[PDB]
């Protein structure tokens, strides 16, 4: 489902 | 059958076999903005659903102008699988074609179950 806070930082790139 | 229109097993082929050159036909189940906006997609191949599809930014107009929407059927033409720091794998959709609009399909096809992520 949703991404964790840490994942969100990495997906931006 | 309606599920006969989908690439049944393509999600397993992407996740388990590392297939990168297939061009599977999938149904959008749900689109979720996450946070310039990015979109996560719950996609179905008729057998399984996968929650970790992400739209390349270049495809955002398809969501913004509502051609890519829940229940539409699309063919993936280019994608990349990437692994995040925590081990979760994400399928980034780079090129796709909407073959049938949500309104022309009208329902979730079949009864796909969540792939083990």
Numbering used by the authors:
A (entry chain B): 53 to 65
B (entry chain A): 0 to 34, 39 to 120
Question: Anything the authors wrote about it?
Answer:
The N-terminal OB domain of the RPA70 subunit (RPA70N) is a major protein-protein interaction element for RPA and binds to more than 20 partner proteins. The RPA70N domain adopts an OB fold with a five-stranded anti-parallel beta-barrel but has very weak ssDNA affinity. Its primary role is to mediate protein–protein interaction with its basic and hydrophobic groove and a side pocket, as first shown by a series of studies of RPA70N interacting with p53.
RPA70N also binds to the N-terminus of ATRIP and is responsible for recruiting the ATR–ATRIP complex to DNA damage sites to initiate the cell-cycle checkpoint. The complex is recruited to DNA damage sites by RPA coated ssDNA through ATRIP. We crystallized the RPA70N–ATRIP fusion protein in the P212121 space group with one molecule in the asymmetric unit. ATRIP peptide binds to the RPA70N it fused to and the linker region is disordered. In the structure, ATRIP residues 53–69 form a three-turn helix with two short flanking loops. The hydrophobic side of the ATRIP helix, consisting of F55, L60, L63 and L66, packs against the broad hydrophobic patch of the RPA70N groove. At the C-terminus of the peptide, RPA70N R41 forms a hydrogen bond with the carbonyl group of ATRIP L63 while ATRIP E62 forms a hydrogen bond with the main-chain amide group of RPA70N K88. Mutation of F55 to alanine greatly reduced the affinity of ATRIP towards RPA70N, indicating that the hydrophobic interactions mediated by F55 are critical for maintaining ATRIP–RPA70N association. F55A/L60A/L63A triple mutation almost abolished binding between the ATRIP peptide and RPA70N. Mutation of the conserved arginine residues in RPA70N (R41, R43, R91) significantly reduced the binding of RPA70N to ATRIP.
